[PDB]
């Protein structure tokens, strides 16, 4: 009937999707083989004797990340050509994943996508996972979205971006990778959500008391966020919302579709013992600037629109009071020309837990997706970093001589400059 | 999948490549016979990178041993783990270049390099799609520095787009073996700047320094020295042969390191390094291990990095470890050592986390830094070269065999500019 | 088939339960071999456990409590360092309460009976005798060993000594408290114990 | 008559079935000699199969599960290089499942008792003792040898070490997996395991 296709590009895309699909299988209660002993049909396809195959494709040019999927616990969960790999990595080069080693994979990728999506017409949309700083996460991210735009013009494309941090980067070419990504991201994606790594680093420190989060603990938290985003499509609820109505209620102008995230409560067995988790209480922690999961403090911005996803034993009257508290309060700032600043959402089934994981059982959680004018800082910062690098042409030879022309950097520079006048002019 | 063909040129190259196949075979679990032992899938999953199968179950290295002398290549064969290499790969030479670069390049090497190019083309072309080469040689010797770099000239021409990583040992600053060092080094570099995709610098003086001052080994020989180069040279290719939470190949390394095509000369470092007495008393964690990484005491080049500025540097972490400390520690160096880092590259450092440590250590770091303190040796051996060349000492052991007057001044000019280029971004 | 396949408890469970399915079928619409969920296991035999007074207690006594295995070695400095905080946590959760919440089983890695008795004399919780086979079966089940004399079946060691693992009725791994493991929360991993959600049933 | 006519297992099978036939006829219009389809054989005697605990298990247990003979030699390069695939494959197939689906019975070509024990200690699955006649019976029945060091009756080598043979109830060859054969897709031949139709029945 109605479904959604998940796409995971790059290393960061594959690992995040590993935690996503591990969480999705537990939540619908299917074994790693694929057999349970139409609610789950939005993600899985029926295939024979009670058997379910996920609607996802894993695209990376590194074999050393996709092959453990082909040889792990989850061998027979996924169909073999869902997992597509190259021979050689993009090597942190956007020009590699867009021009040279690009056309080899994306022709095979479209065929898997088209074969998966041409089953039950009226599917909701696409979900694309990538790291912006990466080579193939940025390179193939451009080219895949170009093919999907020209072919399914009618389509809603959510893009989950693992945006580089301000101060922690772990590469040197990422001022190049991120500015060149956002050119392609602007014209080709539909809703983009930004995730910073050191946001989830410091949420993990204060809320979970882990001083050693690995990439697993970050990926479990992203999975819990996106499980709650699509909870309404999979289960019944008092007031549910699908992925189509995000556009109408979060994106007031064509270009402004960069979203923030905040999940509450993210609490452990030490804390769930002593919190009550009322609807008023968790919505307060959701709006807290440090519990934002993008490292962009919304105090110096103006909330353009705001979407809430309540998930659990949540009654409608407690939501109305909780939201009304937030609007009245003047620490946050709502823009003058958006008086209906919210969209509430309720779903009944509580957030599921991964056994032996880091979270505890929680009666009710909130996931908040926000559009604010605070995003002026997170783009101006990388506007500057790119300007020191491109001042006298560092690490430019990796791109120019490797298949793209000198001037795509300057062209992408003006598009990032135009975005600054846009965020600036809106908040007036 | 992705593959590397190994070439060892010269006495220093053969004896620094022989320990490399000892550190790599133990790592993967291969008997000296060539048989697998130790029932772990992890070990053998990525073995295409260095071995070809022999359909009877045995593994042979993709090593080509090249030399102009019968002597030291037989010592590789007759030792333990010497029977692992395929004997066809052994290309001998008969007469031998006597520590002469012009003999190694122009005359003596020429009749034999066409044979090496036959065996090296057969290995390279054979597999699915090649990933690169690695070459170990000495820039003091004759065959290591003469035909070691002629190989580099020819193999680049044949395969332009495939990478080519060289591990060269430089002339020592203070005291010198092989009195024609600067003649060998300056002639070698001037076309190694334009033909080698990444070059990694080792000095034997820093190796004695570490083997005496930190390891406190009583008597360092080439056996102990080459173990240290082998541990670091296995480190750069942790990523290819084992899975990782944040993987990084050789070309991902290259993009992140060199800002300009001129300069691809790197300084290698290894940590942890403790004596056998001090092993059990030292805390092993990320913050201690990044500290030993950024010491002049620990750098395998005997040139002080504090005199200059790291352009861009890379740290390849190996072991069970949290990426938060692999993140925040590298913030901590740029905020503490504000002076040793170039200022028009925000976030100079690169990190990678490789999930399989070297055997019997919980954690290990290799360090590859691109620094403007490498100009100290480039100016030093320029001065040693310009002192001799003015008065034409030992010239005619290069002029006799067809290397004329102009290519020596061409080498000097094409190296003195390298010093000054580095000073421009000091 | 939890937490691993190739372990002695799993092979012994599969043996007993699958032969019970054969008994049932031979007397008789029965699927073979039985589901792992349908399999039922008796973890501790009648005389495997004993308290501080060396009086035997049955397996059924442990119900409604959060039991955790503690693999310990006498001479290991890390065990000697971990033991006091575990003792502190034991009093502070069991003592100030109207209910017995948690319980610890002690499994040795010592070399002889004398070392085991001297080490176990420090402990107020329950313990398994060294000469009992069940220590060997449990070690190979939970993949806890100190050095690689134990043949792992292509797996690895989950951890080394010491290791505290909260366990279930069927022998499953409920949650793994990271003392010296992937998370490396030494002496603070005790705070991760969810004694509500981990009941022995 | 499957796979070969002239094998010890088949000739003993034929002898037993026609004993039954003649004796039933003599006791009381019956088809002589009996049809191959109507012949019956229990394949593994009462105490030929042992698990990792060295505990004997009867034949009746293997039903419902796709069983594969593994012809192997300790000293062989290719067996050493194949063992990890098979271990991994074993894990990932019978862990994550509704039921146990696969099982491997190991039959050995090692030089002696001690070599066989050292190679069988790596085995989590079942194994036939080396000094059992039944080992050599299965050698001759499925027509494996390292080189021609046993008399075959006009046939040739079906294959060599290493080999895996999915079997059926009546000693039939269900499918051959091509490791060292014509197809030569070793360590990827394991993917070709069809565990629907090759139920032990």
């Amino acid at each position: 009937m109605r479904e959604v296709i998940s796409i995971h590009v790059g290393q960061a895309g594959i690992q995040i999707g590993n935690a996503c699909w591990e969480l999705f299988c537990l939540e619908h209660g299917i074994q790693p083989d694929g057999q349970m002993p139409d609610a789950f049909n939005t993600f899985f396809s029926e295939t024979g004797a009670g058997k379910h195959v996920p609607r996802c494709v894993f695209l990376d040019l590194e074999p050393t990340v996709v092959d453990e999927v082909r040889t792990g616990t989850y061998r027979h969960l996924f169909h073999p050509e869902q997992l597509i790999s190259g021979k050689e990595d993009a090597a942190n080069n956007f020009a590699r994943g867009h021009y040279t080693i690009g056309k080899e994979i994306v022709d095979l990728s479209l065929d898997r996508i088209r074969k998966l999506a041409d089953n039950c017409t009226g599917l909701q949309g696409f979900l694309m996972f990538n790291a912006v700083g990466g080579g193939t996460g940025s390179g193939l991210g451009c080219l895949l979205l170009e093919r999907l735009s020209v072919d399914y013009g009618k389509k809603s494309k959510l893009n989950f971006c693992s945006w580089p941090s301000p101060q922690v980067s772990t590469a040197v070419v990422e001022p190049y990778n991120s500015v060149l990504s956002t050119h392609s991201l602007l014209e080709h994606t539909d809703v983009a959500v930004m995730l910073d790594n050191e946001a989830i680093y410091d949420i993990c420190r204060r809320n979970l008391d882990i001083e050693r989060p690995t990439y697993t603990n970050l990926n479990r938290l992203i999975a819990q966020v996106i499980s709650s985003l699509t909870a309404s499509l999979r289960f019944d609820g008092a007031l549910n919302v699908d992925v189509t109505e995000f556009q109408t209620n979060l994106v007031p102008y064509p270009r402004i579709h960069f979203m923030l995230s905040s999940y509450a409560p993210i609490i452990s067995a030490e804390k769930a013992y002593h919190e009550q988790l009322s609807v008023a209480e968790i919505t307060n922690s959701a709006f807290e600037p440090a519990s934002m999961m993008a490292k962009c403090d919304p105090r110096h911005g103006k909330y353009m629109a705001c979407c809430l996803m309540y998930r659990g034993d949540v009654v409608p009257k407690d939501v109305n009071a909780a939201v009304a508290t937030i609007k009245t309060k003047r620490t946050i700032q709502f823009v003058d020309w958006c008086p209906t600043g919210f969209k509430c959402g309720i779903n009944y089934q509580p957030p599921t837990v991964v056994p032996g994981g880091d979270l505890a059982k929680v009666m009710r959680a909130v996931c908040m997706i926000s559009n604010s004018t605070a995003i002026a800082e997170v783009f101006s910062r990388m506007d500057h970093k790119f300007d020191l690098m491109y001042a006298k042409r560092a690490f430019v030879h990796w791109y120019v001589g490797e298949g793209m022309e000198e001037g795509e950097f300057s062209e992408a520079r003006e598009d990032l400059a135009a975005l600054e006048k846009d965020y600036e002019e809106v908040g007036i | 999948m992705r593959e590397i063909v190994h070439v060892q040129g010269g006495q220093c190259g053969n004896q620094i490549g022989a320990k490399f196949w000892e550190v790599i075979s133990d790592e993967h679990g291969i008997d000296p016979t060539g048989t697998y032992c130790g029932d772990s899938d992890l070990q053998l999953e990525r073995i295409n990178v260095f071995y070809n199968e022999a359909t009877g179950g045995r593994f042979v290295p993709r090593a080509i041993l090249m030399d102009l002398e019968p002597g030291t290549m037989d010592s590789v064969r007759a030792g333990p783990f010497g029977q692992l290499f395929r004997p066809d790969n052994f290309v001998f030479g008969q007469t031998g270049a006597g520590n002469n670069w012009a003999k190694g390049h122009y005359t003596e090497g020429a009749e034999l390099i066409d044979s090496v190019l036959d065996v090296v083309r057969k290995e390279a072309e054979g597999c699915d799609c090649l990933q690169g080469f690695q070459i170990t040689h000495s820039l003091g010797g004759g065959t290591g520095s003469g035909m070691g770099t002629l190989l580099i000239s020819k193999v680049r021409e044949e395969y332009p787009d495939r990478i080519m990583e060289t591990f060269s040992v430089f002339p020592s600053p203070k005291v010198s073996d092989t009195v024609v060092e600067p003649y060998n080094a300056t002639l070698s570099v001037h076309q190694l700047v334009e033909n080698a995709d990444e070059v990694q610098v080792i000095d034997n003086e820093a190796l004695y320094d570490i083997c005496f001052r930190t390891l406190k080994l009583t008597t360092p020989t080439y056996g102990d020295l080459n173990h240290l180069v082998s541990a670091a040279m296995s480190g750069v290719t942790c990523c290819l042969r084992f899975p990782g939470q944040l993987n990084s190949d050789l070309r991902k390394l290259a993009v992140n390191l060199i800002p300009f095509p001129r300069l691809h000369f790197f300084l290698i470092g290894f940590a942890p390094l403790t004596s056998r007495g001090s092993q059990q008393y030292r805390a092993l964690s990320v913050p201690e291990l990044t500290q030993q990484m950024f010491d002049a005491k620990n750098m395998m080049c005997a040139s002080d990095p504090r005199h200059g500025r790291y352009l861009t540097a890379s740290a390849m972490f190996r072991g069970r470890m949290s990426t938060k400390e692999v993140d925040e520690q590298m913030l901590n160096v740029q905020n503490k050592n504000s002076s040793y880092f170039v200022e028009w590259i925000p976030n100079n450092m690169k990190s990678s986390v490789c999930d399989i440590p070297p055997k019997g250590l919980k954690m290990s770091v290799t360090f590859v830094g691109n620094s403007t303190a490498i100009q100290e040796m480039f100016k030093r051996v320029s001065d040693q070269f310009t002192a001799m060349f003015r008065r034409k000492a030992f010239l005619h052991w290069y002029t006799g065999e067809g290397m004329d007057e102009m290519e020596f001044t061409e080498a000097e000019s094409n190296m003195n500019d390298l010093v000054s280029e580095y000073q421009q971004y000091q | 088939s939890q937490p691993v396949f190739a372990s002695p408890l799993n092979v012994e469970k599969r043996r007993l339960n699958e032969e019970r399915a054969l008994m049932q079928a031979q007397k008789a619409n029965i699927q073979l071999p039985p589901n792992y969920g349908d399999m039922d296991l008796i973890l501790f035999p009648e005389g495997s456990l004993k308290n501080s007074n060396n009086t035997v207690i049955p397996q059924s006594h442990l119900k409604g409590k959060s039991v955790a295995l503690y693999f310990a070695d006498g001479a290991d400095p890390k065990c000697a360092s971990l033991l006091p905080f575990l003792l502190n946590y034991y009093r502070t959760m069991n003592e100030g309460g109207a209910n017995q919440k948690i319980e610890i089983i002690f499994v040795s890695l010592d070399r002889d009976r004398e070392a085991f008795e001297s080490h176990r004399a420090h402990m107020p919780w329950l313990s398994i005798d060294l000469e009992n086979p069940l220590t060997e079966i449990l070690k190979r089940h939970f993949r806890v060993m100190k050095e690689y004399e134990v043949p792992t079946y292509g797996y690895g060691s989950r951890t080394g000594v010491p290791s505290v693992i909260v366990i279930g009725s069927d022998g499953r791994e409920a949650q793994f408290l990271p003392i010296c493991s992937g998370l490396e929360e030494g002496d603070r991993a005790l705070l991760r114990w969810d004694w509500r959600n981990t009941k022995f049933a | 008559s499957q796979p070969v006519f002239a094998s010890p297992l088949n000739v003993e099978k034929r002898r037993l079935n026609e004993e039954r036939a003649l004796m039933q006829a003599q006791k009381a219009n019956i088809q002589l000699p009996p049809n191959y389809g109507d012949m019956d054989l229990i394949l593994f005697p009462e105490g030929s199969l042992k698990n990792s605990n060295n505990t004997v298990i009867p034949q009746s247990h293997l039903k419902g599960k796709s069983v594969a003979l593994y012809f192997a030699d300790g000293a062989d390069p290719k067996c050493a290089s194949l063992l990890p695939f098979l271990l991994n494959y074993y894990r990932t197939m019978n862990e994550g499942g509704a039921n146990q689906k696969i099982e491997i019975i190991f039959v050995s070509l090692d030089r002696d008792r001690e070599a066989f024990e050292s190679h069988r200690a790596h085995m989590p699955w079942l194994s036939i003792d080396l000094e059992n006649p039944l080992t050599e019976i299965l050698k001759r029945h499925f027509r494996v040898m390292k080189e021609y060091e046993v008399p075959t009756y006009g046939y040739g080598s079906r294959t060599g070490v290493p080999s895996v043979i999915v079997i059926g109830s009546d000693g039939r060859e269900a499918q051959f997996l091509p490791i060292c054969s014509g197809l030569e897709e070793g360590d990827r031949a394991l993917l070709r395991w069809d565990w629907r139709n090759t139920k032990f029945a």
Binding site: E27 | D26, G29, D31, C37, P243, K359 | Q2 | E95
Partner: peptide
């Protein structure tokens, strides 16, 4: 002399078969 290999990948240590929610 060689010793046995004492390291496990991230992926297997994190993604163990955990018993399923209904």
């Amino acid at each position: 002399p060689t010793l046995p290999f004492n390291a496990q990948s991230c992926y297997r240590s994190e993604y163990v078969a955990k018993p399923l929610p209904p």
